């Protein structure tokens, strides 16, 4: 239920939304996204035309909503100045600057901000850590430089930690493409005394 305020009549972004229907309503920021999420849409070519248009509009919004969003769209080949101005003109007024590289990407942003109020499904880096081969490849890679593929080719020769812990240094030197240095490294690691 996104609310698009009527000052976006001739705008090239409303044609590129597809997911959720929209509404027309006299709210002060232009795109109201559910609750406590307002957007503001600005192309940098318009910023070079009227330079006093963003700084006036920031004042009338105030501190109403809890998450404000300023998304800007770049289409000017010299962006190394206006971005450095807009960051300092946004930091003191508490917004969030999102850069969009093309008008089609604004459709994904406008839909993605609407259709998300979900749970933290990104937190656990160990989201797939519940299987045996994942545990051995997450345990063995703690040494200095041994990638996953050498752990695969170490798995498919013995399979057993009891067998791997009893092999000689020359017995572990039959490495397919690992090298003698990593073999000597792991042979020192897997048995060296902790204390003195």
């Amino acid at each position: 239920s996104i609310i698009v305020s009527p000052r976006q009549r001739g705008n090239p972004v409303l044609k590129f939304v597809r997911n959720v229907p929209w509404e027309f309503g006299d709210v002060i920021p232009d795109y109201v996204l559910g609750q406590s999420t307002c957007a503001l849409f600005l192309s940098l070519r318009y910023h070079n035309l009227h330079p006093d248009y963003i700084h006036g509009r920031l004042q009338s919004l105030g501190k109403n909503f809890a998450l404000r969003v300023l998304l800007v769209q770049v289409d000017v080949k010299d962006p190394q100045q206006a971005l450095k101005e807009l960051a300092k003109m946004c930091i003191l007024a508490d917004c969030t600057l999102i850069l969009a590289w093309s008008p089609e990407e604004a459709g994904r942003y406008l839909e993605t901000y609407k259709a998300y109020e979900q749970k933290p499904a990104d937190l656990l880096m160990e989201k797939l850590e519940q299987d045996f081969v994942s545990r051995v490849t997450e345990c063995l890679t703690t040494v200095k430089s041994v990638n996953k593929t050498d752990s695969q080719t170490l798995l498919t020769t013995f399979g057993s930690l009891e067998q791997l812990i009893a092999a000689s240094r020359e017995d572990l030197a039959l490495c397919p493409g690992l090298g003698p240095q990593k073999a000597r490294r792991l042979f020192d690691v897997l048995h060296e005394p902790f204390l003195k």
Binding site: I91, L97, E104, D122, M125, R135, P180, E192, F194
Partner: protein
Amino acid sequence: RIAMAPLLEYERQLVLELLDTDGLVVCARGLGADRLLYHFLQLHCHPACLVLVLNTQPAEEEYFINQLKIEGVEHLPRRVTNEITSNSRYEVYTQGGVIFATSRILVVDFLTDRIPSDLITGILVYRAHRIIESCQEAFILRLFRQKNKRGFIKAFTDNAVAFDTGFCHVERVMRNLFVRKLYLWPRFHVAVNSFLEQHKPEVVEIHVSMTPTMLAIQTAILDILNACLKELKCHNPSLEVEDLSLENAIGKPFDKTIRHYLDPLWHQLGAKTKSLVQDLKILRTLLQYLSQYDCVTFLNLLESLRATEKAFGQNSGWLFLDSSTSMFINARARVYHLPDAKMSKKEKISEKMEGEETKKELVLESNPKWEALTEVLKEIEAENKESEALGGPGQVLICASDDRTCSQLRDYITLGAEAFLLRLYRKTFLTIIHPLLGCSDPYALTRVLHEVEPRYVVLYDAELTFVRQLEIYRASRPGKPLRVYFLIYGGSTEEQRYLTALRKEKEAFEKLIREKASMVTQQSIVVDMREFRSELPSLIHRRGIDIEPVTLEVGDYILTPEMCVERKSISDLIGSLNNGRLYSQCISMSRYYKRPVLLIEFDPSKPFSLTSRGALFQEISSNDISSKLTLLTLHFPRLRILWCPSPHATAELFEELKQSKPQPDAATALAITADSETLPESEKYNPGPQDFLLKMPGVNAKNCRSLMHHVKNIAELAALSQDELTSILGNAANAKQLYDFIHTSFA
């Protein structure tokens, strides 16, 4: 008489030029460039003067230290490391002398200004090719040039290939190293050839023709590599120089060009090229594996490549391991015979049909290097024997590339030829030999060379660096001519690898001479140690805002009492948004500091769109970078994002941002830390087993500390019973988990 000792006349000139006017000397493939440095070190090594040697490595020290020690000079060079009790402890500088150092431990001392910069007399760089990329050294020098009066720099260096690389003009390296002149000195120079001819060692080049069944492996491996390189070239139009032709994919320095070309923005490549690069690496190590190792092991290695499909699927590709089956048949012929059956019966010839009960046996073959070696070592004993006492006893130090070869070669002579085929086949079902190369100390074989004066020397395929070292060994004029015996496979990879690279140097030095003949209230920012490896602190310091260095745990820079910046590029964003570590970082940053930001650096030439356009045209737009970015910004309302186009713009954006705010202080910035990690001196070898032992299933910090404090090493964890582990830990479920993990197979 040790090492370079007395320098030969060709050297004597070079030292003369570099004692008056400073510059950088471009020597040629170990023609002795190292040696020069010995002479400088002894001369300035007196006690009351100092200089720093900039880019050494650990072991070399050892040889240099011991050699100069033999002469008996006092105040021998001292070495400084990170673990030296930090400031105050480094009082060695006052005491003076030559001092070795690492690139970092310096930068910190100079910035805090603890070292005396009044007294420092000069700087002797080494391995200058490394300074080509604008990294830590540049900072060490531009920081040094405040001793404008006395300080003298010098650039002994080698590896002429790097400078020859396109887009890295020497002048740029020249201007950075702060020296005026240039001293080329190659190995066709007019005064370095007339001396090295008066005494020359004799070669006895011997051509050894390879078997008719080796070419059937080699011309197939090169065809598969040639078919892989075009597919790498098509789906990546970026890399187009110095990594294109076949010539350059055979030599040893090929992976450095790929690791320089594909390390910026690795994580926007996809899934096709990321397997293809691994394919190219394993196909390059196959071509070296066959020649330097025995046939039995190679039949194993090619058969061990077949086993990473039936468990892991496309591990080493589904593209090349199910095409060109001539490799197998060549491979299969070496070790096992083909099927055989009959009974006076016509139309009786099959693939695998039983008369055919016994496993057919194919004789093992021997690569003719072993055969043509034993003519030379039986000639040379008679060249002894015939000489009797009159010639003298003589010694031979036959040499080989790698340690494992040395092992085999050792046995080929000790037991006998049929011994290996019997010994190897079983398991799977005077004369000193030292290896030529390693990540080991390069300054070693030379020690052995002076060690055992070799009358006759015999060399398995080797790289330039050795061959030339031997001519310099011809420094004693009267000594009988050491006779080297090259060995060459006729029309092969090692001869290609040798010849090309030799030509590569020849063009390389030449272009140089043509470039020599063409010349005629203040603020602060607390900086994190780990971040010094990037050009941004060298661009902050130019504008005037001063930098003080210490370690951190939460965020890269601290611009002001209430701000914290964590810089991440466009590839590390894609990485740390799918790996899942930025979410475990901002939860700490917003907890600790007031207003967290993050700085994203795109690139204005190639904008990655961060969205699949067709999936945006079709799907509901989930599981991308944009959706996971929006979901990150939705939770934190107080995060700020700063986009910046280039690392020259960040130095401007930083000085505009702290305009009227106070100055962040170092005090207690280290104090905030975080609450974890226990105590690290618990294990004498703490930095080894722990890292493993913690990732094991069934452990916690408390039980791990106790159990580690009880049992000795990680071997007996698989040996001791589960009852012992559940008694020493008092828990049953995680103990049974550990016993199930430590004792299992794969299925």
